[PDB]
Subunit: 298 residues, 3 copies
């Protein structure tokens, strides 16, 4: 797109504030940002806020979201679809034109780990170019195993294809499949989908902890066979709904856009890979690391 040549819009922080006991404002951008998706490989991504996947959103079950998208792309319209919400797609997930803003309001009444993404046609193009992310909706009544959890992180799986190549997006194997982590608390890492950051700077934990991961496979195209090496998932909640309870899973199958809350115990010091067990995708980048120490520090 000639109007994207030489464009690299610096990342813009997510803005969020609570405006009532059950109402939250969220303001995001759609913007064009260069991201290093593998060593030496820049992708001029279509993004929310200059991150791909986009910034983490966390709200409470029952919150209505008053969402504003400010479209900084000079030429392509963009939009937002949160899987968390009940909305009219043709009124509430509609396009915002270049250099304009749009505000849409809708409730998040279901707990879980939901994908969000741009919903502008062709949606495959918008998602594959980087416009995907996760919104977590915290359950009003928690999860039954909350009291056992020592530490938590968010991981997202996505693919990258040949740059803005619709043929490849439709018909080609991914070039890269990757994990990123999005921060829940101060100090947690906040990374983009790339082949290397979570290898070189693993997530950290301490021997003996029960870890919770909030996970989503945003695709665009692949399913995920999510596995943590060296452990078994004690508890799994499909899509993050507390009802959807499995136990003792080695591997959790995620559809494209599928989420889960998974919990596992790390019993011994060392480094624990985190994969999709579709090992062609792991080989193409989808391995993160969890470093487990006697103190929880590096």
């Amino acid at each position: 797109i000639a109007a994207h040549k030489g464009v690299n819009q610096a990342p813009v922080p997510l803005k969020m504030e609570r405006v009532g006991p059950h109402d939250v404002h969220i303001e995001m951008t759609a913007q064009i940002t260069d991201i290093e998706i593998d060593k030496g490989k820049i992708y001029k991504a279509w993004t929310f806020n200059g991150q791909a996947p986009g910034p983490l959103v966390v709200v409470n079950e029952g919150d209505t979201i008053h969402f504003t998208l400010k479209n900084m792309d000079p030429v392509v319209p963009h939009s937002m679809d949160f899987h968390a919400v009940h909305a009219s797609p043709s009124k509430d997930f509609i396009d915002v034109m270049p250099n304009k803003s749009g505000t849409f309001t809708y409730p998040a009444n279901k707990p879980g780990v939901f994908m969000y993404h741009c919903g502008t046609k062709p949606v495959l193009q918008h998602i594959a170019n980087g416009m995907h992310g996760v919104i977590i909706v915290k359950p009003k009544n928690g999860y039954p195993t909350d009291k056992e959890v020592d530490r938590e992180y968010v991981l997202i799986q996505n693919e990258w294809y040949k740059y803005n190549d619709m043929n490849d997006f439709q018909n080609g194997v991914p070039s890269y499949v990757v994990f990123s982590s999005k921060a829940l608390k101060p100090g947690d890492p906040n990374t983009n989908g790339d082949t290397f950051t979570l290898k070189e700077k693993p997530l950290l934990a301490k021997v003996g902890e029960k870890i919770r991961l909030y996970i989503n496979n945003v695709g665009p195209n692949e399913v995920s066979s999510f596995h943590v090496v060296g452990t078994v998932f004690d508890d799994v909640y499909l899509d993050g709904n507390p009802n959807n309870h499995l136990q003792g899973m080695q591997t959790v199958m995620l559809p494209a856009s599928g989420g889960a809350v998974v919990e596992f115990t790390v019993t011994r010091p060392g480094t624990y890979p985190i994969v999709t067990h579709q090992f062609n995708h792991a080989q193409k980048g989808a391995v993160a690391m969890l470093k487990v120490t006697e103190t929880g520090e590096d």
Copy 2:
């Protein structure tokens, strides 16, 4: 197949009648019929009854089916495998030769949303050419959320490949992935797997309704990540068995041949896309639409 050149056998209605409190007759054809699978693209499908997927079958849990296949194909044998039934495959799902009929009897003792398909070797060829469909077996005791359901439809996902090309069937990406809808009640649409009909003539509902979809991904080859935009599934029953109960799912993973009953609420007027969230497949046709109005009429 030289004997199929210029053949286009007009669709034949399904014939079904109940012959006892727990016994039902079903008569289908195997026939060769031209179907427009994308605009300008005719596929000379191998079909049951001139539909691909084939006609909907609905029976009650505990019904024995006395099934007759009348093979109208001039040269290729065909057969029937219902996933609903307990049967001996090598005695009861056997070939019926051209211009002959066969009758086979077997019980449907399990509630759910089951694939049916031709079982003639090579089965990949028969299924990929169009010989697939759904049989619903209604549970004796219903589903626990029956009283909440306002409106229901059936949707089926399938793929289309290069015409009768076994190499492509085994080794190639689908050319199209599509939804069709099969009628449960008078007035409901009854369509073939194509890229466009359910976009141009959406399924209809009324604001505020709880909709139930009976869904099956008949493949032949792909899994499905089934999602309705703008909503969350309140309840999901895997394979349509009431026991297999999930709640609050954004997306339901279906294996090839996998079924489900899914229920969701449409809260606002507008048009709601229905996708597989494997967006390469959505881009290649697998998007249906649900139009939600203040009255339920267009």
Copy 3:
């Protein structure tokens, strides 16, 4: 690998012995063995014990495994990762060099049907070359449907690609997808992943029996849509954990590395195919047969 040319190390029996009420010794080899994966097609597999998938391991929930790997490969290091155990990957799933042995100890505290595989980088290469298998951990309290089961077998699904071709492993479709069966009791078959053995010598059962299959799809890359023709799964336990209970499933979706215990009834004499319902994979070998007779004998 020049050092593998002309090497075909004869299969070595698994050695296992119980050394305490909750402690078991297991000794395996890593070795290079020719396996006929389709008629006329030899693959010089990287294996445990000269089998691919490797030999069945069965232990009890709560057993600590004292595992020794004796690496007979003349040039490539190998390792072992059991999904059943809690272990430090970087201390306990580490490489054993050519002509050396390593012993690692770790507990299996979770019941189920777990993948094991070599964990040496690149793991895709080790798994795709044949270094995969199943360990079953028997639940202390059994499964609720134990008393109904008449006969049981183990089946494993894997793929084969172009020989030791990392490009194909990452980016290509499988050349073959196959089932094998591993013996639980004297007399049961014990086979390698190939396109034909379980067609030509089906598993055997008797009319009216409830059969249990312990299944795992070891990949490396594909998901499985596991289905037995002519029946419905009465009960399914995902990953073999008794908690994860489904009923009345036509088809069970397995992620890569995913396991299950599935149970079904065979009501009539005949031959019952067992497939992945991703029919491109079935066509490329992934069909086993179950022959059901009035006596249970051939």
